[PDB]
Structure of Probable acyl-CoA lyase beta chain:
Amino acid sequence: MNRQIVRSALFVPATRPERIPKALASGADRVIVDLEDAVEEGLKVEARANLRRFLVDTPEARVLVRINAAEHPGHADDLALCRDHAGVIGLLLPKVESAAQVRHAAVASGKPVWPIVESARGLAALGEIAAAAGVERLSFGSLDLALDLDLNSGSNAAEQILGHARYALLLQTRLAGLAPPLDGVYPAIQNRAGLVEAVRFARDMGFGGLLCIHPSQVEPIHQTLMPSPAELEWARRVAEAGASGAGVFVVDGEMVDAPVLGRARRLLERAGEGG
Amino acid sequence: MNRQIVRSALFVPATRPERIPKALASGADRVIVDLEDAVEEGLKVEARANLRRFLVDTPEARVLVRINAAEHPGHADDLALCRDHAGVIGLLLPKVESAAQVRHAAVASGKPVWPIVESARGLAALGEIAAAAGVERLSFGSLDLALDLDLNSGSNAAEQILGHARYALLLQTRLAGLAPPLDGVYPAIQNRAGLVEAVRFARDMGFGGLLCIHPSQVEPIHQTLMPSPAELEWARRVAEAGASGAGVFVVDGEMVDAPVLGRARRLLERAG
Amino acid sequence: MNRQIVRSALFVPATRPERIPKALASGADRVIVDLEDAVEEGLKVEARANLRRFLVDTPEARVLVRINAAEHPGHADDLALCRDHAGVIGLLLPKVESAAQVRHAAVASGKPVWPIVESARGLAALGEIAAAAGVERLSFGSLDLALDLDLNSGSNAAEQILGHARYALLLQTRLAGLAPPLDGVYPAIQNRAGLVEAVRFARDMGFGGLLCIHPSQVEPIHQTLMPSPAELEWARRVAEAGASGAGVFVVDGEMVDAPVLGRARRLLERAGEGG
Ligand SMILES: CC(C)(COP(=O)(O)OP(=O)(O)OC[C@H]1O[C@@H](n2cnc3c(N)ncnc32)[C@H](O)[C@@H]1OP(=O)(O)O)[C@@H](O)C(=O)NCCC(=O)NCCS
Ligand SMILES: CC(C)(COP(=O)(O)OP(=O)(O)OC[C@H]1O[C@@H](n2cnc3c(N)ncnc32)[C@H](O)[C@@H]1OP(=O)(O)O)[C@@H](O)C(=O)NCCC(=O)NCCS
Ligand SMILES: CC(C)(COP(=O)(O)OP(=O)(O)OC[C@H]1O[C@@H](n2cnc3c(N)ncnc32)[C@H](O)[C@@H]1OP(=O)(O)O)[C@@H](O)C(=O)NCCC(=O)NCCS
């Protein structure tokens, strides 16, 4: 339902309900309680009840739930849990491959849907998936895509293929008028330098945030998404020269036209200093 | 209709009519007189009149005009100016988002249309846009695309996104049988090394030229687009070994088959 | 229909029939005898007859044939040769731009078709081409695409454009359920280091092998495609932890979730191991 930015969406599996408050206290903009791929078949019924217990016992909590996809016998049970607790403000639909799967999850839960693209089928149908009623924003399942397309995760070639999927997510986001999408999970938990590089790369591309998997990732993500002093000072220089009214001028040796001035004004506004 | 290469298309705003002769004298293959985003709203009526007088006073001049798009109240006056002066040999259509917008601009002006792809919407509809009657060639609005898709212009990530959009311009160019497209503006006016590299990259990719924004960029663009001595000597060597007519051979340690021989002959003929 | 991996498909022109045995003795997974663009128009009739003796004289030989496409007058004669010799196990269809071209080459020969994408039209129609009856797998003509799209072969910009065609082959391979595709020819015959790099790049991206053009290319292709000791030992460590428990865990500092465990298990199975 939002058009605002989500910087961080932190997974926590419903098998570890004691970790859900820790996820919420981490400062992440969103917490995702997982009922799907982090939870083994045998623990999924218990985990669903764990999540029900947490939501009842923590009525002020607001969380996303990654539900089992329609193939699973627990699909309707996941959707009903989303529907029946005000603490569930949206669901992640994994393995999404059709507008129909989005519509069914949205109507059944009555809550916003985050489609997670993790397969070639999802990419091929992303136009209709993004355009489906109930979609809040799109996110990426990088490791799922590497499995589906047989990519060597982390190599230059895999990242080039994933660049094609990221582009599609960013294109359809603007085509369907969705809220800012989230780039995929960065799995090297303690590699802050690599996490920082994944975040800046994602932000530079128009992603609003990242799915994440450990509370320690939250602080690097939020600091990296902030405009640097240099980006702020550039935009101030561009906005100053543009205040008189001129159509085209020069700043730092570069021509500045309407699109450049607009980017500079939006950068300043998004950091808390509009006109 | 015109399917020649345009190496350089130099913008000049109609607010600076004394600069229009300067732009034509730069040697650019095309001059674009701008009535759109380089011209403040308050100056657009005066600027259109500046352009009218330039065209009337300079009848041998042939120029492109960037008009305001249909949403702007001055759209019809821009189209009329394009229609009524023989010196206007084509128009740039900004923020192009549908075949219908091209068809209307072409019918109204009776002149070739240069769609400028500057948005995700334009990209989504580029198949129909490129195929529309009246299209001469496509050009890339990199800075507009960066605004529309919220890209950090100049970063590695932004250029990767821009690479995907350039591909669509290059693909649809070939599919619709258009003239060679133009890559986007390089804004760092005095950075010749950076400008030289953007041009080589664009050419290597199948672009025929660049939109440009300062007369000083024209000579660097034109020289960088020239085939180097090394490329020409390679093409001549490939042209020898292929003159006998033999099926497949080797040059410089590389297999040469029919497409390589074809590529070499086209390089030599485009160089005279 | 074959869904095994072909690591190497070695071209040899039917004008050099003495070289066809050398091509097979090289160990390539497939030999492609060319009747099309490597053979001068004036030699195509004799070349077809050269290929005819070779199959007659060598009945245990199994080869692919690159035929002349539909408007060349020898098309039907090429198809009859493919149809009538058990040694022809498939054909490469050059200049493919439609599903109908695939269907007609498939039914006429009764043999599996490898569509070879060499033009922008072929790319734009690749959804239909790959889904066509008779398709075994895809490959492309990288040099042909460079001609058709006016690319400076070998430059970074050209490889960026070819990256879009590689993505398309890989996307449609998975959508149509085809066998692993082959990346394009690497033409610098003796540059093993460069050939090794193109192979690593192709495999990391999900290609099963490469078209090649000289016997000396085969051993480098085959050696580069096998998983490294490091990849195997990593996959062994990941699989061990995935039996020891259930759910998400960490290996080498990285989170391992269901797709990562799946990828590690797939690598071990393809190399003949397990766990
Ligand atoms: C990867 C993971 C299993 C690591 O768990 P671990 O090895 O036990 O964690 P560490 O020892 O590194 O850190 C544990 C500490 O952080 C907390 N923690 C770790 N991961 C957490 C998470 N995702 N949410 C909340 N708290 C978490 C633990 O409660 C503990 O705090 P404590 O010391 O007060 O008990 C864990 O981060 C996790 O479950 N996240 C993955 C999210 C997921 O479901 N992934 C699938 C979608 S891609
Ligand atoms: C030219 C520009 C750098 C601003 O002007 P500027 O800062 O005064 O230019 P400079 O001082 O560096 O150079 C000035 C000299 O080059 C001339 N000239 C400069 N830019 C010119 C241009 N686009 N077209 C024609 N002539 C130009 C000037 O007349 C002057 O020559 P002079 O001394 O003989 O009078 C640039 O911002 C511009 O106007 N670009 C045109 C782009 C446009 O119209 N739209 C942008 C679409 S992306
Ligand atoms: C490119 C090509 C002409 C080079 O031939 P060349 O210059 O004679 O190559 P070399 O001198 O290095 O040959 C060395 C040895 O390999 C053999 N050889 C070379 N290319 C061969 C091939 N494609 N198949 C089988 N044997 C081959 C030669 O016969 C020679 O063995 P020999 O000493 O026993 O006679 C040759 O590799 C070829 O025809 N292949 C290209 C594939 C093709 O059809 N092209 C179009 C597809 S993109």
Notes: The pocket of coenzyme A (ligand 2) is lined by residues A 248, 250, 255, 257; B 10-13, 19, 22-23, 34, 38, 185, 189, 213-215 (CB under 6 Å). The radius of gyration of chain C is 20 Å. The domain at 8-225 of chain C is CATH 3.20.20.60 (TIM Barrel). Chain C touches chain A at residues 163-164, 167, 170-171, 174-175, 180, 200-206, 246-248, 250, 253-260, 262-263, 266 (CB under 8 Å).
